[PDB]
Design a protein around this ligand. Structure first.
Ligand SMILES: Nc1ncnc2c1ncn2[C@@H]1O[C@H](COP(=O)(O)OP(=O)(O)O)[C@@H](O)[C@H]1O
Ligand SMILES: Nc1ncnc2c1ncn2[C@@H]1O[C@H](COP(=O)(O)OP(=O)(O)O)[C@@H](O)[C@H]1O
Ligand SMILES: Nc1ncnc2c1ncn2[C@@H]1O[C@H](COP(=O)(O)OP(=O)(O)O)[C@@H](O)[C@H]1O
Ligand SMILES: Nc1ncnc2c1ncn2[C@@H]1O[C@H](COP(=O)(O)O)[C@@H](O)[C@H]1O
Lengths: 237, 236
């Protein structure tokens, strides 16, 4: 039956385009094949990456919606596009680390794979020109990016999302190492928004440690799309 | 009578820690060594150690009298103080009342930016890693501390900020930011280390004159004068 009409492009980011629609409070999120890392210094076109990321995001957000998480996700429209509630993004990346990896393990002198003694929650300030710096709750409130009570709600939702995702991935022999979330305001409510995909998570096979995510691109490991396909195929088991 | 200084336990960038003939006491000896930028910048600043020992001693005596549990027992001489020997928790606990220095630089703010809330932050005390900014979850997650210990540290830190902000404001100094360290001692958390113009930013509340180690860091000149000014004001 009736479908939204895609109107003007509102924004093009590193990996997606956001389009207006004929509904003032809805956008279409379009997944590109662009891959980027290292403050824009590293790029590639990874054929079909956007299709896989749209498909994985859609599957995960449908699952989160069913678990009662309030999210922007309405429906997948085609191989690359999904219909979402238009949100005013809170300018914080919310990162969960179950295991220490990447730059974070590096900055603290930890072996990659270090088992953290408590689940890590952290914030990066969403400003690519400042390099998306790590900040704490007081910095975030102090510069007017958020309030204590907004952060409290964000953390509650984030912790629930981690419990749900850790378990869904564990069932399929995937360790959910870390991931990044974004939230936004819609109808005065705090919604989970953006993407949850191998671009925004670290996924290691639980037996071999094999990486099935964007680190295969960041570290020139090859078979990038095969790792993303494997994540989707396991999620669809 | 007087405790006896025995072997050196540790030489840091600014102070030496000496053992004493009491197993639960150390002597903290203030050098004239100045350092900045991950050890890359160094100088000797004549009498800096004396002024920092004098300022630290004055401040810790005040905090002791206000009921803060600290390591400080007594000043011994121009450079030395007698302190309880603590097991330092490996965190630099930084308070920022106004954004300046590294916070201002990394968040693209002007120094002097007014904050909507007092900032409490941690750096991991590991000079080989450059004392990186970390959050509470990182600190607990790597085994540096526990949530219960951090909670206590922050409660003491907030109290110390209130006392120091007021003592400095009475002398027309804005306490812009500062760094504390804490240690474990006989089951408790004590304020330890130093509170001086090496570990605080002090701006005159009217003119903005900087009276702290930024004068050394930024080659501003008249460095020791600034330290003398802070001590003289504290002694009004
Ligand atoms: N539901 C939404 N409404 C409006 N903006 C969104 C929504 N979900 C995500 N965004 C924003 O859209 C952009 C998605 O594209 P992306 O390529 O990830 O951009 P960026 O390069 O800015 O990180 C991001 O800026 C993201 O914060
Ligand atoms: N700006 C961003 N856009 C998308 N995903 C991100 C971003 N920042 C962090 N992440 C995700 O958050 C997790 C932690 O990233 P991090 O370790 O901080 O980056 P790196 O180690 O690659 O420097 C990873 O899964 C990463 O994919
Ligand atoms: N009461 C105390 N007992 C034991 N160690 C202490 C005490 N107070 C401070 N310290 C430690 O003594 C050293 C003081 O000298 P400093 O030059 O500041 O060293 P650093 O270069 O390690 O920062 C620091 O490592 C500090 O943590
Ligand atoms: N390793 C350190 N030693 C002494 N003082 C410090 C240290 N790190 C931060 N400070 C103090 O903490 C405040 C914030 O410093 P910065 O992070 O450089 O802006 C300033 O008053 C510094 O002098």
């Amino acid at each position: 039956n009736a479908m939204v009409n895609q109107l003007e492009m509102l924004y093009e980011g590193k990996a997606k385009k956001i389009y207006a629609t004929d509904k003032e409070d809805m956008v279409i999120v379009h997944y590109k094949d662009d891959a980027t890392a290292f403050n824009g210094e590293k790029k590639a076109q990874i054929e079909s990456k956007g299709v896989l990321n749209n498909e994985i995001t859609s599957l995960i957000f449908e699952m989160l919606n069913k678990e009662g998480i309030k999210t922007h996700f309405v429906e997948k429209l085609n191989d690359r596009d999904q219909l979402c509630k238009k949100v005013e993004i809170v300018p914080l990346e919310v990162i969960v680390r179950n295991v220490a990896a990447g730059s974070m393990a590096k900055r603290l002198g930890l072996e990659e794979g270090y088992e953290l003694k408590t689940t890590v929650f952290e914030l990066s300030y969403k400003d690519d020109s400042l390099g998306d710096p790590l900040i704490n709750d007081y910095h975030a409130v102090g510069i007017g990016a958020t309030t204590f009570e907004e952060l409290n709600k964000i953390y509650e939702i984030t912790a629930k999302v981690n419990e749900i995702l850790k378990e869904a991935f564990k069932k399929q022999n995937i360790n959910l190492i870390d991931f990044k979330l974004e939230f936004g305001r819609y109808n005065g409510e705090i919604l989970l928004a953006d993407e949850i995909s191998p671009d925004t998570c670290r996924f290691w096979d639980a037996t071999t440690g094999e990486k099935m995510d964007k680190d295969r691109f960041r570290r020139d490991m090859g078979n990038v799309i095969n790792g993303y396909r494997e994540v989707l195929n396991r999620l669809r088991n």
